[model samples]
Target: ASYTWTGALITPCAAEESKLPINALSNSLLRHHNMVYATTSRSAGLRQKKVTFDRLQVLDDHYRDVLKEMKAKASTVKAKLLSVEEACKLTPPHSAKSKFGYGAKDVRNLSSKAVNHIHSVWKDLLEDTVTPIDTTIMAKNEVFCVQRKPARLIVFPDLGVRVCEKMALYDVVSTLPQVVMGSSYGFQYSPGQRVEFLVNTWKSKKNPMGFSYDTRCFDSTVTENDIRVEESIYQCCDLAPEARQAIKSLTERLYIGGPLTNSKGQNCGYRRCRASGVLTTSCGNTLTCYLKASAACRAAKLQDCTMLVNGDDLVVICESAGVQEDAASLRAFTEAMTRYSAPPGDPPQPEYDLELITSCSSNVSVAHDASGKRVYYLTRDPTTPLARAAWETARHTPVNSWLGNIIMYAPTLWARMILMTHFFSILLAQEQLEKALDCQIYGACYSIEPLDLPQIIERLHGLSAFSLHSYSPGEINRVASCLRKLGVPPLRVWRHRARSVRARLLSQGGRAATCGKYLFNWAVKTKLKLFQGPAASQLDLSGWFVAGYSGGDIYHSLSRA
Candidate 1:
């Protein structure tokens, strides 16, 4: 269904763009950090035009088979409703304020007014299933330079509706997905697990043929039928009648489609696409997309297709028939997906090199641990990450993008050489190394401290993260090209600065010594002697990577990185 516009502007609330002048802080990190740029609402109209399309869907036997298997597992799960106070605790501090005068802080505190409003919203959801819920549409604030890709759009329900959504769907999303999808659920894995899965899957194949498929407009590809199908799967679960009814109501009134309002509260139009900011958006999309791709694989007669799906991002590792047959099979796969309502953004092609096949915005690359043992790790082009890190160094933002990227991408060559080297130097200089900064990971926000990196890295990636070296050729080239395009100093420049950055850390001692010995050892002629990693068994990383968390009301209170 096409949106009927009332001609009200979908205007941005505010936009913060970096300047040409390189500040002292960012200059320490990047030579031309000033070359960094940010995307704004001006580019959103282009994305809107691209995403708007007619929907067509067709299901098959293989689709039904996979759906049946999913429902079988979903039925075994008994998701519980979180108490109102428990649900309130998961709300992010920066969440949108309610139209009813209370905000995220009020909700977190379980203020009488906020709790009462949420209760009303829950009751309303149970009572009314036909009325469309109102949503706010906004463009995302992200960084870019030469990449002319437009900003992403977010359609979000109000704070009250969101609280109600969590009460109904939070446990279901968190527990049900991993049970049903098994290891194929990408969001359930840590960085180390992700790399291990890719490496094992590739090696397991006789002749591994891999390809990454991204839908042109993933949300737009979602149809009313798709929402109902996901709901039916949820209905199979052993849930409370209230929970079941609320799920059905949300599916019809909110999940299917809704009206879009702007920041000024004017009706901009109506939406029939996936709401990016709903609790089930990530989980539902993954289930629907996974079902279609599995069915498509069967339709094409591909052999032993092991798929890994992270929301809309998909990677298929399967036995290759032959060069000619593989090419033909991929085309057939494309056609099957198209008929199933998922058309390609870029044509999917097979890659023999595991390093060449990118998915989840990352690739498998080779590095050597301290023992000179070859290691497989996840990495990606440092263009956008570097751009954001440089931009954030200049001024404070709502979240700590630089800090989060460093922890998440700690094993990557670019992140170690640049992100760690720069931030450590800055924090050491300011004597604020022990402080916690607000950061986001997989769409969930947290308060993270820099000094806790060694423990966090050990848990997240492995002790080898400290000793990872001798990065792959393709990974190095991509970072270099990205540097040149963004007018950044060469890797040589970062290496030179890292030598000094590393020396400073050594003088600080304790965790800083490990930072220098491990993170920036690439800079020094003498590397550290490999031995036991940090003793950090007290760290708890549960609820961090058990499911797709984007737009879900998930908050891991622990600083598990």
Candidate 2:
């Protein structure tokens, strides 16, 4: 069983508003706020239903062959155990607090109080290998539109346990997956790298057929056996004996399952599946999903298949054996996954066009750069990103979703025009164009200055981002329809607005002028050349995409360094 509940009420810390409340600020960013919504505890039951299920397992030779290959690669990794101080440095500022009176700040500052408790927690984990760890379950605050997806549940142990997790598995998780899966492990790729991989795979196939495998509830699909299998993979590495024991204990006591306590400190339930927000969640899910999908590829006799896996999200490109054959093979793949205890939310289908296949909610897209060369890049429908941006303006939040989306999707025609024009207008009106706001990429938070978007985008998406035009029809229509749906002014209006904003930035001069030159050049007729802009040479972008850490024990202070 994945979960069993006491039926104690799942309480909230305070009253939650389930709908996006529009203010003058929000209304300015978006007019039709009717579609936007926030998920609260009220919708947790629906999520639980989607996440909860019975599991059945049947492993065959293909599964064993894949496992054997994974273990063989895993045996080559020589991972280190992070010291208390090293792990402490990795604690994020926004992390949750402990009932024991220490918090993220204390840990970050290396306070003796926090250090001593972390050491104690590590020792406890090493000695006590059988007691179930305690975790707090909460409904995440996620914004969506009319699809009205319910709140996702997050299950995490105490802060002390989290630090212990870092000590035991931080390096292991970071290093082992790459060594085991190589380029197939998607976290190690930057957005640009991701697009290149997709393009190459499609080109390699004679007639490419690609599809995204949508695991209904990847975490819930994980059984105790899956956890043990993950641990065995970990043990294959060359590790210190103490490190080995701590990893084993963490696997036995914490990784497999734990008792759930809600915000009100009531026993809301018990969890026996993958615990979200843990150190190894991303690595474990990546390995497990890759294992299942690789074997399923064999069971379905997929030829020249290339897999890109980021946690549970998977995209595969393969040689198509005609439309009917592609459909049958995909069905066979799903059946093999079902036999291995993973079922899909929506049944999988083959897509002959590369642009139509979405993985990690992003698709390969096309746009022409300043050189008039067609550039392939990654992008997605802007509906949710725009909804969240509208929500951001009304609400005072720390990290900017608009900024993050820009970094991740900078090469898109839609983002450069709408996001750049829209935000620059607000920044100009408020006289805050130079302010450093936070945006995330590949799950790590970064403090980004609006003035640096030219360079940042150049670094992440290349200089082509500055001059992207001639976007694909599918992408254009998707953006156009999304804008109309949100009541945002169309592309022509955005272009008219950007010209004014570009002039405004140029008037200010310095980095502000640089932004106008590089960011909004597409809005103007004056031609520009790709230069050795210092932003491209000056930025450090190494760790930003080396891993996924959405709810993991990680953060980065890398900015302009």
Candidate 3:
């Protein structure tokens, strides 16, 4: 997609000769994390590149050894991030109100037609769910078991050769968190902890230094009491008033959505985006409560505990407390927990009691009657499989799959075959479109290949159905042709992305199989854009928590070792 062509771009270097190929090692070992990024400290290959490219300044050479030591133990961090991102992709899109930005307008009417046309063409080709073709199952090549295994962590460019030779199993899943390069501008969780992360380069907002990790919900503060507390709380009982107040302070600081019932529909929260948008109380009333300082703070602290509870218990608690508008605001914390939590059970059972707690001091408090009551506590560990899998996005692979790679340099004509199979872009200019099909004249002799070529008479016809930048049946035909011509071996890839990305490039046929909520989303968003419709109803609560946050002393000490 980049237009900046360099001398290296046209040199046609063998795949092994290019740094991009070596760097591509990052993508091959993605065992768990959904999002992965290459970093300097963990792998010498990347560290050397960072220094040479000057993308990230190494402030002090003296600190290099220490930084290297810290990262070597946390070599699999990238893979864990990628795996989490994969799971997140399966999560539902949060329901948001239709707004002027990116919303339907008069111009969008025509655009809508185009979108519809695309949808009509490809709806039948897409499969919404990732089943039958589950890559995880296929890759494992065993009967699928619902084992809630700790997230798997694999790594490419496994630190230095020496570090790789010494790394222990636990070290690969180190909980230490790194102070992301160039993230000093704002408040962040304790940076040098061994916590895991669901890092994403593509998802992070663009910054001058680089993409950043999300740390708002992660914490690594080890108290004198020997407890490492993550700040983001999903549930909390027997909380100190000051601690509760602190949480409230944080919530007020963290904005969700709404504005005092402004002209943008009904006045809601003060912010344009509020967590959960609005808390639906059992009373059947909707209000922006999560944004309120006290409520939001309490909810934030609770989020820590809430994310760790079993999913069934979470659902029960939400249903039991839904009627209370004040309680409804806490729903965001619960929802956030489920973002990357899956447990094998009927979800968590509802548990809450009005047991009174006595305060020893303004800061010290304990619940005396918390017999059956359990208060979820924040742990400075990457408990979720998604978080634990952060380190696996880099490893050698038997096949060509970028476990977590994002770079795409100029590919050879043969390599171009795959990219061209869909609605891939190719050589530009009207003249190029006007050129006659090369196949017609070059392959005049009898051959089965000629049957696949579509008719080419005019500019559109002359256009290669599959090219350097397209994915369609024509692109598939081109790939098949190239494979037969070049004798490339076959490899089964992650079916969901492979199939969907290709289907989307061809036409819009796969849309019919979208989730019911998705269809409802399209309809609502469309109506809102066109006719100024009301926002769709918010989704119901699903309970579950991500028990471990990616920031804590345990993470830092472990990963840094």
Candidate 4:
């Protein structure tokens, strides 16, 4: 069955065309227009409630079952804890500098001052019972546009709590969820895999039923009662008594959240928020939220217990209960969630079309593959990625966020040509072509080496990097509208840069030459033959540490190299 979109705007901008053609990589709109702005609104108050852990959670059998499964998996994970020096060395060079008077570079170099400060912080975490962590809050850009919109708060934990969080939650996050939720955990799969799962699941049934649900202020909605720890849950796991005690205590004080302090050192009062900055935030929310939602699904009498969860994002597919009864069942689901303190964002929306179900702010869009088969893909507007690209060009960012977006959305015309061409040119000019950056795809982190761009492109886009694609009028319109809105230049400018960057990279020889041949061969007159296997694998990932939910890093591969 074909899928169609019939909802509110997918892109941040209006559907109208711009009057003038714009530069493909320009930020003139952001510079000249007073449109981009940030607002906290009621988020601060909500965050306060989220961070304050006042009530205790009453665990049911469902919660116990989940915890039992998670503990069993944790027992199998052989994740060795990194020493203080090793952990600090993993700090990304572009990470937010310390307000405590040390820079990321200082920490990376193992300067006595930085190391001593880190040790002191760790000691305090272990010894002090009432020390509230300092949190920094900033307005992160939502989808960028010429039209003004409110920005979301990106709550950041201090450097001290950040390191401690990695030591605490890294193994639990990496290994446990796949055990409890199994394939229902969304981040375990790539976009292609996720789409394939939904499609196959849909086709398996004679009459398939599915709907995506959104939670309002998901991170900010986690209550203290919602995050309570159970003794049995921790005791069942294989852990040192002290380690177990530390985790339990940390969950009560830090994980459950503490007081928030501003830059001026003034108390902004207590927060119950799952500090958007902690390593456990994503995992905690995904696990707890799934626990509640799964229970509710059973209560609603939904069949074929299959679901996909990514943090607060959720989609459920089940055998139909007939049209009328299905709506009533969803209503029943809404009731169950509210009782569980995890209410639906806009009630429970039931969509017969799986493509219409938007989770992770992305809906399904269709484009034909090399074999002319109509391939469905997950896509969203280019606003956020474009905005970040502008910021990256203007600042010293640790990661190239755009490259990750490009690889994920490679089949899209904008991602394939505009994002790829723009970033590759910048990297070439800076002589950072082989530079590896930490990028997150579907939540789990990986060190993305630029030399492996060909392999990733081949895997995601499925041969479109070298072959031609005649994009539909709607695709062209969306691309053009985005460029104009973000003050980016026209397609010609991107083509010109791709050619220059390709020539320069090929001349550099070795891995750079191979990258030029495969990634940019589509733009050149003569296409180069490409070989597969082991390109991404040959690059050693041993030095790379996964960027936890806290969004902090462990190593500066660029600086060390």
Candidate 5:
């Protein structure tokens, strides 16, 4: 009864170019063979530059030494405050060797533009610095190459079982196992296979921000100058002459040179393949979803359910067997989790062989022509039974009903909270706070927080007072209207507890306190999932800015609790 609407469920595979088996559960784990072109190549337009053996070793040693030192320095200076000189000292020389250079462009303005990062540092300044966890990597490869396990471990909810199963089903193309790798940005890459994205952006004479135009950066070798240096970048890419030579014969989907034009005719810039860009993209989109899906799949298996994500698109992977049933149940579960501020006490836990999925393949692309050709070839067959079933099933799944597409943005809200905290800590100017506030407004809490209780009440009151408040009295819910206008309404009788909290904030301090507290609570909340609302509202929109900026009254209509 929680979900009577089939219209809400997201047809996870709607984005891909081809139709796969209806029962084939998507391989959320993107294999190398899944790329646009099977055998992709870097621009041979620029010849492979060569450095003599002696020069190559010197460059290698120098950069390797630089990297080791840099990494050590970065780890040591974890939470320390830096003065302008100190900050500038930390300020990278705009060279790839510097940590500042290695981080995102936005990171350079950490102190100013990203109020959250600045505030986060202040929070850390106040935090009880626990002794760093005594962590060590353990190699797991009873199969082949012994490798260290990542420090980050993720647990999946019951809903994720279907996703893991679908991964197993689409495994038809390759034998890659189905475990999620939390480290290295949630790579489901196969065992021993190293996945990396490289962008060709380096200091360019034409652009102040540096132009990233090289194609060989995706090869996973940042330590090598051949990969990191602009003019001499590919020298490092060709380090393993055999591997580099071999790479030419393969087809790779590089995220560099210019905007990547998709079938939708949308062009994405080289940022897609930049090292940091690649890591962030995969971690947020494909990797995070895979873990969720894998966990759900395992949980479903326990209940003998066949739920799974259709893996046709690199993002959603595959659809769930009990798509309507499980999705509805999942929506309720997620809502309850948000409402209660903790997981269900008796909630289902997902399980799977972690080793299985991570071993599937490394990187999101393959340079080989063979796999790319086959993928598109299959796409051409809409009449085939496998394709036909996919079409029929996908028809029923709505674009709006997916979980991840709805959740994760809450963290972004948390990030905003961090910024305001910084504004207060630095005792910033009103202009500064206003600018920070504007950033929040523009950045997508839609100038306000989502599903927040106080925010809801405040907005409702604002709307009712606004010149635009034209809804009929009948159209307005009585309790909501009362809660908005009157301030101190009976909490439980009127709305959800989250709504109550928002009401409380508005009743007392208004916007400042509301924004401040949400950020504070978000930063320190033990269970972050509580704030992560339904999956339908989060990532469904395409692109980062749009996804982050989609704002509206949904924040108010839904029960915050």
Candidate 6:
């Protein structure tokens, strides 16, 4: 009952803590507040002007080649059309309840009424030109910085449109971008892989220069024209004529723009901006943003054509320009993006400090590996994971988002002690420690066994959990300051609870014991399990956990067609 809430490590504050916030949560909140004032008071006209432009992308050989290659790969995939029952069964238990006198469980049970209602929703989707999606928004955090940022959850799709999206765009989004961007595509790699790439690219250079760029409201900024479906673009794909028409129609009605309704049933008006919850939202934004950035980079003549872009999150390494020269080059880069209608946030200020530039909620931090070698890893303030931990405790979340966070940030004191201990204890109590639940990492889904967590952590964090790490003073202070601000207990509280959780885990038998012995082994003096498994590769780390993104599903669907 004395379990820690946020699982954050506390450190003493610096003598004079900077008034400005750190971490994305804090940075975004302050940034958002400023944006509110600017939009309402000054830049209203500028926004109107920007939105008024009729920007159109002409797909040339490059775009065609990418699409052609993508379609050829997609052609081989086969996904089957699931019956209303089949699709409904796949729905998560914690999925948003239907506004229509039903719940996910009702649908999953194949209730006659639920099936009929779903069919009605489906018929409407096919018949209507457009449908509005409902979204729920909330503030989330346990930030070292003083600000709190907002997060949006697209509660649930109309069951019918959800299926339609699967049939129409799942394969395209899942498979297409990898072919287009190659290694530059971000989701295909893990945080380790990403850092590995940055390190290799930097060291390979006699001198390496790089910075990550943040785009403000990248999703909301997508214009109707920005999502234009050129004839040539679709022509490259060998989709059946019906599928082609569905793609075009969906593009116009849903992709290009759609109505947004908030939780209160207030019509937030038609969105020319991309909907944050759609299946294609991630892929669409990544493809469009990359295309724009790629062209802009070429125009700016930035050295090292190599770039890494994950949706709107971007990191680029180029020839070092001194402060003034870099400023000028960034200005040029900003201009090119503006011309392409994909503007930068904060005018692309380049950073020599890679750790200072966060991407995908990860920032650079240094720790030592098991071998005592210095390691640079992508770490972040444990705000989101802590928030998620609280949510998981109170609600039946479909996916254990916190587990993914722990796996990625295993070596972080907070993740190892707070997140891992809390969740494993809960799972142990539920007698579901052996349950291989679905959790996402780096944009891919995996059925993860709690027993295998040690292996996963070992692979990701270089088995640093068992190794001693002398965290820097700055890191220590930031962690401490965050705990005080968030009103979370200090690291000692987590350590105490971790011991109890570990003891409980070890007291159990079978896989649960295996899980406890491996994941919390570092906490105890004597290690219980050596864990000689084949590392992260042995897990069923499939990319598709959604309705129909799986390769087998894709192949089946195509074969039926």
Whole-model lDDT per candidate:
0.84, 0.85, 0.19, 0.62, 0.22, 0.57
**Of the pair 2 and 3, which is ahead by lDDT?**
2
CA lDDT for candidate 3: 0.19
- What would the TM-scores of all predictions be? 0.96, 0.96, 0.16, 0.79, 0.19, 0.73
**Higher-TM-score candidate among 1 and 4?**
1
Leading candidate by TM-score: 2
Question: Which candidate order results from sorting by TM-score in descending order?
Answer: 2, 1, 4, 6, 5, 3
Q: Which digits, one per residue and each the tens of the lDDT, describe model 3 over residues 384-485? A: 111111222223322112110100111112222222221111211111322222110100101111112221110111111112222234334544543333
lDDT of 6 at 195: 78
Give lDDT tens digits, candidate 5, residues 300-320.
332322211112111111223
**What's the residue-level lDDT of 548 in candidate 6?**
19
- Candidate 6 Cα lDDT to native: 0.57
lDDT, candidate 6, 1-561, per-residue tens: 101112122111123221222343322112321211101112223332333333333434543444455445444544333467556644555445667787767876878877787777555545664554443221111112225222222322454455456655555665666765677787776666677777676666545567766665576557666566322243345566555666665666666665544445554334556555556666777766776677667667677756787877887777776777777777777776676566666556776766666677776677774456887766787755664555455444456788778877777766776677777767766778777776655443455677777666665555555453666566667667655555556666666666788778778765556556666665775544353446423544334222212111121110101
Q: Which candidate tops lDDT?
A: 2
Across residues 235-270, which tens digit of lDDT does each residue of candidate 4 receive? 345555545555665677776667655545555455
Candidate 1 deviant stretches above 4 angstroms: 15-21, 33-35, 559-561
Please state the error at residue 297 of candidate 6 in Å. Answer: 0.6
State the lDDT of candidate 2 residue by residue for 1-561, as single tens digits. Answer: 788888886667778877788787677667888889988988888887777777898999999999999999999988898888888888877788888999999998889999999988888888899999898888988777774678899899899999888888888888898888988989888788999999998998878889999998899998888999999999999999999999999998989998989898899888889998798888889999999999999999998999999999999899999999999999999999988878888789999889889999999988887778989999998999888888877776767899999888888876787877888888889998878887666666677778877877877778777877888888888888887788887767777888898888899988888888888888776767767546533667677777777667676765444
Q: Flag the better candidate by TM-score, 2 or 5.
A: 2
Order by lDDT, highest first: 2, 1, 4, 6, 5, 3
Pitting candidate 3 against candidate 4, the one with the higher lDDT is: 4
Worst 10 residues of 6 by lDDT: 552-561
Report how far residue 555 has shifted in candidate 4, in Å.
Answer: 5.3
